[PDB]
Amino acid sequence: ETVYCTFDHKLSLSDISTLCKLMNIVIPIPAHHHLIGSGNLGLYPIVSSNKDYVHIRNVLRTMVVTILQKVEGNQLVLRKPMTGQQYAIKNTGPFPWEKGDTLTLIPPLSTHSEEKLLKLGDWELTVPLVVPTAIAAEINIRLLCIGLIAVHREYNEMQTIIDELCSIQYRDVLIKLPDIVNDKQSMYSMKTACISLSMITAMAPDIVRTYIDRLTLEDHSMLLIKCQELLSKRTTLSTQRCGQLHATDIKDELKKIKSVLTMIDQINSLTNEKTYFVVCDVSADNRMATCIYKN
Amino acid sequence: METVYCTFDHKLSLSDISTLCKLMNIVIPIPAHHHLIGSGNLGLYPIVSSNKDYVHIRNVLRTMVVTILQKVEGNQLVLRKPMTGQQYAIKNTGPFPWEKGDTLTLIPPLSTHSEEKLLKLGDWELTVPLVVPTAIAAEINIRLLCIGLIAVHREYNEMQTIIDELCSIQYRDVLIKLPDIVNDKQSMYSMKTACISLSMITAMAPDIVRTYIDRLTLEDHSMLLIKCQELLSKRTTLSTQRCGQLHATDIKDELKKIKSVLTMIDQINSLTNEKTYFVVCDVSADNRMATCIYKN
Amino acid sequence: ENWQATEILPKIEAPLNIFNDIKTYTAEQLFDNLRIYFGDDPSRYNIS
Amino acid sequence: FEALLGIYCNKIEWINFFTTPIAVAANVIRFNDVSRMTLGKVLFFIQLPRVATGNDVTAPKETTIMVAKHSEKHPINISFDLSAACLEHLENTFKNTVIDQILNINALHTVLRSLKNSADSLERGLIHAFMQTLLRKSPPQFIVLTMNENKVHNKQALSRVQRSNMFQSLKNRLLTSLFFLNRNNNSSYIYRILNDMMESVTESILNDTNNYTSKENIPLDGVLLGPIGSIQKLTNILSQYISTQVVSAPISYGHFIMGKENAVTAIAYRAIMADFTQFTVNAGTEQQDTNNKSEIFDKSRAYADLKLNTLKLGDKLVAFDHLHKVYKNTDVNDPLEQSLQLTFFFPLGIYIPTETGFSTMETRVKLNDTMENNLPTSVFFHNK
Amino acid sequence: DTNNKSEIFDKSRAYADLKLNTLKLGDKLVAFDHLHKVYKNTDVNDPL
Amino acid sequence: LTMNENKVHNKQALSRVQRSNMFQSLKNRLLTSLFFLNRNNNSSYIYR
Amino acid sequence: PTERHPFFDLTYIQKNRATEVLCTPRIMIGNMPLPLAPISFHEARTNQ
Amino acid sequence: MNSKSSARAAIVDTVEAVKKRKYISIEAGTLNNVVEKERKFLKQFLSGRENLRIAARVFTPCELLAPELENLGMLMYRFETDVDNPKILFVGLFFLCSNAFNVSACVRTALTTMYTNSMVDNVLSMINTCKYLEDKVSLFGVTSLVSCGSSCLLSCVMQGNVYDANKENIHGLTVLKEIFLEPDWEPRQHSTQYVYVVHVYKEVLSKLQYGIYVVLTSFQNEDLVVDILRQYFEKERFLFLNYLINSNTTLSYFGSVQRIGRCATEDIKSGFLQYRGITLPVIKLENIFVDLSEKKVFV
Amino acid sequence: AATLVRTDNFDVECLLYSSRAATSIILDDPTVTAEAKDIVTTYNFTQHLSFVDMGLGFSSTTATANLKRIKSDMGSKIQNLFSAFPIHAFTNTDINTWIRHHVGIEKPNPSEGEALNIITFGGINKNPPSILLHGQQAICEVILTPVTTNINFFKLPHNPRGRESCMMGTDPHNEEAARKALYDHTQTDSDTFAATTNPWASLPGSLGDILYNTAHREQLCYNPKTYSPNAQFFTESDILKTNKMMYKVINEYCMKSNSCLNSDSEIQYSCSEGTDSFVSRPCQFLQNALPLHCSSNQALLESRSKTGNTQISETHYCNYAIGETIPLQLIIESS
Amino acid sequence: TPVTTNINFFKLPHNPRGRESCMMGTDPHNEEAARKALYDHTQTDSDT
Amino acid sequence: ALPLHCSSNQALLESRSKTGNTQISETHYCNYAIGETIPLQLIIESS
């Protein structure tokens, strides 16, 4: 199945040459549909206009991957990939592809000093970065660290610690993560993601405490011992002032567990990263690579 | 080969064959993986006589091999075994409006009050599992795990006061509920591992994170934030405050700890998360049949 | 952009193209590719 | 017994493009490579005539203007499926059994009627896409009338006094001529405003002798098309001026093929000169600047005759119809039915100063003296 | 799929000629009458 | 008369705004055109 | 340009010869400026 | 009916469908200019819509491939290396099951005596100095076409049945009999089972030791298979719960499972390999549709 | 006091005129393609069209003809700003609980940090009104002086910014003089010796600018589905683009008829996909709104209902009554 | 009540239940939302 | 149901009978008179 895209404005000769440079690329698409305009081609109709990063990560999980095949006189042929078959992907990201790597889509590191591959009358074209899975995990963890420590004040080493977070290296290609001092160009701000992590790490100990303080007569024999160890190692002085001195409602415990489980299945987006492509061979000079399509 | 022929053992009626003509393009799971099946292995009634436990029916429904109804002819009944990544049309049974673009899972039948107007024929019924969105499938699995954690707390009438508030849920203007959870020990194993992971999240949680709560309360202020302040004020059953707030370039240890916390969260999500069986592309205007490009 | 094609090459006449006097149109930027010149510009004759 | 009677089926009517009167606005020419065409453009050459100035007035120089019009492009599609069982019963018979014969004939009629339905759907999609583009182009009537009223001098583009009075005239035209059929009843007035439309609209470029020509060579001039709810009232108020006449109309699409010249220049220079061979052979001769027919726009096509509901607006014969007969049973709306959004504003609690206060309409109402009556706190108004 | 006549609906029957009070409403000829001549003297009323 | 004006547009189902404005139109048609031969006298109106 | 929010009086103050924009909440209703709340209006609210 | 005729009709239909996938009709004007070799090639005009298996050519120094240049069909592992000269390097399943801990000492030493040289010793030192295992070395596919030149050329199958060409002697995955185990109540339940690879770590008081397991089960669903593997590994899982906090090595789980692909129940047969006289018991899976899913970790 | 603004949607039949052969269409032979799947075989027929528009002037016009209906309520359900900007809060829990209590919002504790995509990304109402009698309604809100003169301001078509903001009196391609027109009060407005009538709407950084301009709405989070009928007056990044020359303004206007705005589902939402055919917004084009027949009490409203004099505005002592500028009730009664 | 407003209630065709109970504004085949329309006063009625 | 021509006293009812204005509803201080929505008396007078 193919997809035709007819642009909305006119294109310069340099723009058509840009497309001929970009004649193989992944493009995400909202509607699984045959005729799509440039008003909905790409990801800039979603990022920059709507909540960013975590809904962006959910959306990049849930949109339709579709690769460029051929550029006509003014139209775009986009073939949408079938599972289990080979395709060919050009290398736009900085990190070098190698054979047998799994590939995934991360949102672009949205510094507004990028060359803005097309910029066609307040519309621009944004692609996700195809990247190996290990680097995708590493980028996700570095971004959550930046978004956590950017809210703290009065670290006098805050500039060098943000710099040591932003500088990552993978197979001799450096990149600086553009979420520096909260320039707000696209920080992505990740505030529910850090809030969700800290709601988990704060509501965890008392929920496992209220469960484990009950039904030890039955011979579970493993869980009871493990929680005592795990809880009283880190939180060694456990529950001195107690807050309310053990006046809880069963409905309150219900609401605690229901909330702490909502947080997990809604941070499901940053939970996993699926392997969109498994590259089998890579062409010479690392221009493009023939891969197979999965998920 | 891929095609399976179901042949009913018991005879039927013309109202029955009219219902089977109505009932076309419905996913029916079979345990056999054979080319010929009888009415003994069609559907889910050959398992829902054993204790009727919803977790048990869900587990074996995961073990099932799903097929799609095609071309009811005579008393024979064609079932296509759907291939990977291909497109198939599915008639819907779950009481939902079925917005496109979402993933679908396959869930045991939530027992409504009215008996099924589908097929009841000689002490044998056609138990068809529902097809639901993945988000409400995860919601149901949350509710079951939550009833496990709370029904450990052995009470009298407090179980009822929890259950009647809990079970009736509303997703896309639709009320559903799941009764008669005898709270077997099979949910207790699936809950023990959640308990393990919460213990480890606690022990491997870094110093940035619990600090980040209080620091964002001091920096920003919001009603929504207050709701989280209300939870942290309503339970203060830990109270173990840390010593140092310097963060003097411990950054690799911080990365290692945050990777661990995320991975334990992924384990609890792998508990509560059910497998997407279908991906909707095109929906009829009736919201009655819809196309998918994915078969387990 | 090619305007000496218009300046040199064969042209088909056409009756009543306009009503509101393209002075106003050109002055208020109605068009997409327009080009005006007042005196007879010589750069149609520099054919390379 | 239960008796069931005869099965009655629908017959879908057939929409030729050149039967509907949108095709007098259209001029449609097959050209098999707009899948590879980047930009179609037409280039127009206007030289302005000037007046001779009086004594000691600076004469305006000779003004030469070129305008280039580009091509929008727009695809349409139609999908229809065939089921696997219908595809099985389509092509073969497994045996000479009667049920196999019946289902074979049924599947054959299913495929044939589905192909017919898809062709009808492509024709109606052409109708709808062209109506879409006309409504995207068409500015509203108060803007068109105000721009016909306001013109310019050579010296500078539309002075600030001109455009401010233009804005105030836009206010006045909008607030008077908004809801048109509903306010008045005068056939004289409504005929006058339709005359104002047909004088406001500018004329096209191509004057073919036979495209939509009446008897004895009088060309029809444009189409006025509305929805049926408008046009029933329009016939009831303008039945003096509505006639039906037989007009020589085209029936087939124009057809254009490249030559080796055009294909070679498309390969070498990414471009096409249309009318290339006339454009080549009229070069060295005297008749350079003259050329007679544009092959891409004027091309020999078959003609026929058909009837059209016409009006006469000051010696102007105009086709006049509704597209409801092709939007009878369609999922898309008639796009002439469009929504307005008017924004309203109103106060509450405005304290009029007591110090310069007054009242007219003293004889009509009389309040009871209470400061809730003597200060506005609420505001009352009517609903729909 | 084609069928010409429906025997349960179309059947050969004898024809005659009679008069009716007609109206003309935009090229629509409509019979126009009252049933009082069959409700002249009965045990019921005219159901209109 | 109200149903032919408020025929279902080609969308998924009959809409709430559609049927509510249809109900208000029912009120208005009933309170205007109820007693038909008795209120007006325009033969043009009654013929209409 | 001084009036920006009807609850908040804004001004300019000088500390170390910098012009120092300054927002300060008008607490009471009378501290709104008298061209923005006239004294007859306060007497009318009082009579309420 | 006739039966024999309809059977021949179906066989002719399958052969003609194979030809429709294999060759392409040419609508070039096809003039009489060309020589007869180009004539018959323009009449046939093959395309690669026939094999439908996905392979990859691979170059590896031949010191590492000691039994695997002789015994076709093996798991292979990509080891990325900080050396720029060779960025990736390829590894046998047995070469990594040497320092896996599941293997008993007799089989471990026996295989090592196969795998004793300077290159293999240096690579094992590199693998041990790596922190974790699963994302410095990784699963790559199944072996076919060993060339054994100077630098040996290995083809390797990503997806589809394992064969070089001719679709003859379709090789099978060879799993060491000690390292595999099937956790399910009924082993070999009804029909074709899915073969997985499980990496499990362990800590003997100083360092991490990895273990390479291969499981065969009737379950397709990955949540079900990690739920049966937690029940299998609950004790050592508990030991890592104590280790992973006091450690500082960058890992966050106990193990990970990844699907190799389908098998068949009747296509499971025992046997033994032998290289340089070392008899070595294996379970030879016969026909395997290789299907790599994602790695799924469990803690 | 307060200028309340409200938009209303009208079902309008609306005819078109176009000169003959005004624009040419070139098409491809409809291409056949087939996707052979395991349950169906789908045939797709595609066709490319191009349109060249041969007339130079506007060879096609379109005039509003006749009302069908009014899908708007013309009700009074004001914009629930606690659901429009549902992220904000007062500091103390007691204060915020009492404010939510007294203004009567449902669901007063959002649980946003738990489930924020529910309410940052847009609070899904999950329940329409169980009864609905007149269609859609939505009413926005501008806070104001009790001083602002009625007869200068409220009785006429006028921008509720206070200072009028119509770019048909501004130098084209002069954004400096444009911002001086939208903000300067060293200069005067026209129509009065009064550069302002709402010094909390017109002024920069006032409660017009900090509340309804999308340049600050995108900073302070909100539901994108919530329709605000005053963004069309206070968004200034979408009026400095209207500061162009006149034919570009009206070409941009008639190209702005994608009509993303629906007229379904009990209240004015603003979905942004452009499935609907066409809308036309003359208030958007002229950058002012219209006065409607409101009054101060039932005393003045009864004499208005007696004489029918909804056009002429009239005032009592401190009770005022505004005259309507388009007699749409008479329009509906005429059809 | 002696308090019920005339002009909102009595001067118009209106249900004397006080709250209006016309099923042409309710979701068809939705008895729960129907009884919410006939009984609920967390919600408002229309027209006031 | 429908509103019909009622009033609070004969004072309002006599002026209603004078001007015939049974449609427009009008109020005194605490006395009110409700306008009729169907002029059925005029209907019966017309036939």
Residue numbers in the entry:
A (entry chain a): 2 to 296
B (entry chain W): 1 to 296
C (entry chain E): 2 to 49
D (entry chain s): 50 to 433
E (entry chain t): 338 to 385
F (entry chain t): 194 to 241
G (entry chain s): 530 to 577
H (entry chain S): 1 to 299
Paper text:
The T = 16 icosahedral HHV-6B capsid structure contains 12 pentons, 150 hexons, and 320 triangular triplexes. Each of the 60 asymmetric units of the HHV-6B capsid contains 16 copies of the major capsid protein (MCP); 16 copies of the smallest capsid protein (SCP), each atop an MCP; five and one-third triplexes (Ta, Tb, Tc, Td, Te, and one-third of Tf); and 12 copies of pU11. As a result, we derived the atomic model of both the HHV-6B capsid and its capsid-associated tegument complex of pU11 tetramer. Beyond the capsid, the helix-rich tegument protein pU11 forms tetramers, bridging the space between the upper domain of the hexon MCP and the triplexes Tb, Td, and Te.
